Amino acid sequence: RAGPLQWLAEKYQG
Numbered sequence: 317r318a319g320p321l322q323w324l325a326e327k328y329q330g
């Protein structure tokens with residue numbers, strides 16, 4: 317992926 321960002325952003329919101 318384009319770094320461990322998308323899943324962190326998901327983790328933050330939800």
Ligand SMILES: *CCCCC*
Pocket residue numbers: 322323325326329
């Ligand atoms: C996909 C990361 C942002 C979701 C709110």
